[PDB]
């Protein structure tokens, strides 16, 4: 009469569902294959989110692919052949060489 069965059956798991929700967040954001994470790991996860977990733009599946396509397209347009695996140092180098020839 004080604590009904339909409440008692939910309380059976409520404490464990909070741990399951913490483990679900840490796995999605950091890629752990473990169980029993802490609120410290939750804070680490939510302050170091994978760029693979954020949806992309302009054709990218992720924000990692989106930025890589943008950098690769500038570098591919300057070098004149389609390619992959460029960096931000290539971007500065190749634009410095085109700016010089334009001047």
């Amino acid at each position: 009469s004080y604590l009904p069965q339909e409440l008692r059956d939910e309380l059976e798991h409520a404490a464990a569902r909070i741990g399951a929700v913490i483990d679900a967040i840490v796995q999605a954001l950091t890629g752990t294959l473990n169980i029993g994470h802490t609120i410290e790991d939750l804070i680490f996860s939510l302050t170091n989110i994978r760029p693979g977990a954020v949806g992309g733009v302009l054709g990218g599946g992720s924000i990692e692919e989106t930025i890589k396509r943008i950098v690769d397209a500038i570098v591919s347009g300057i070098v004149g052949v389609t390619g992959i695996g460029a960096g931000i140092s290539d971007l500065q180098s190749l634009i410095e060489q085109i700016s010089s020839a334009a001047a």
């Binding site: 840490v26 890629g31 752990t32 931000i88 140092s89 290539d90 410095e96």
Partner: protein, 201 residues
């Protein structure tokens, strides 16, 4: 005329070219894995070596080729390379702060300049092009493993005419260790440690 190499290639030296200037970088080191309450140490950045090769003295005729093997830059009878950065050894406690994978600086030589590879701040992130140190790892998920080292690169300039005050070199890059005959050290101690301050080379 400037070319940048980051994959094995060979190209002909131009007819007008009185000399070739080159900056060459080592591969970066791989970062260490973290553990629990310990990060990995990051790998060190590749070394940077520079050379000028002059026509008549080092190369002649129209048969010449400039050949980059992926870690050494070469012409018939001469070659230049820079030492690969040391791998990350062991671990760093959390209280000493997040590992940073150091990049190669804005090196400049005879009016050819190599863009600075930025530092890598991502946990276990790959070293930046050129030659950057692969960052040290954390211990959760995809952040556990250390990053691979930044790949080796060359920047090469085909040039005409002398520069102000230039004198033709031996045709090697730097092959000489620092002069340690005047190296000096200050030492201090406790009951369980020794502190070294080296100087003067």
């Amino acid at each position: 005329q400037v070319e940048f190499f980051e994959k094995p290639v060979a190209i002909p030296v131009p007819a007008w070219c009185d000399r070739i200037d080159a900056i060459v970088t080592g591969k970066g080191g791989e970062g260490a894995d973290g553990f629990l309450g310990f990060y990995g140490n990051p790998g060190q950045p590749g070394s940077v070596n520079t050379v000028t090769w002059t026509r008549g003295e080092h190369f002649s005729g129209t048969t010449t080729i400039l050949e980059w093997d992926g870690a050494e830059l070469s012409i018939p009878g001469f070659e230049v390379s820079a030492a690969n950065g040391s791998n990350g050894s062991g671990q760093r406690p959390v209280a000493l702060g997040k590992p940073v994978g150091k990049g190669i600086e804005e090196v400049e030589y005879n009016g050819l300049k190599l863009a600075a590879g930025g530092d890598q701040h991502a946990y276990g992130g790959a070293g930046t092009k050129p030659g950057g140190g692969g960052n040290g790892g954390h211990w959760l998920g995809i952040y556990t493993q250390g990053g691979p080292g930044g790949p080796a690169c060359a920047a090469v300039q085909f040039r005409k005419g002398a520069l102000p005050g230039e004198v033709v070199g031996d045709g090697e890059g730097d092959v000489t260790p620092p002069n340690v005959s005047a190296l000096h050290v200050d030492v201090s101690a406790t009951s369980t440690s020794i502190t070294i301050t080296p100087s003067g080379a």
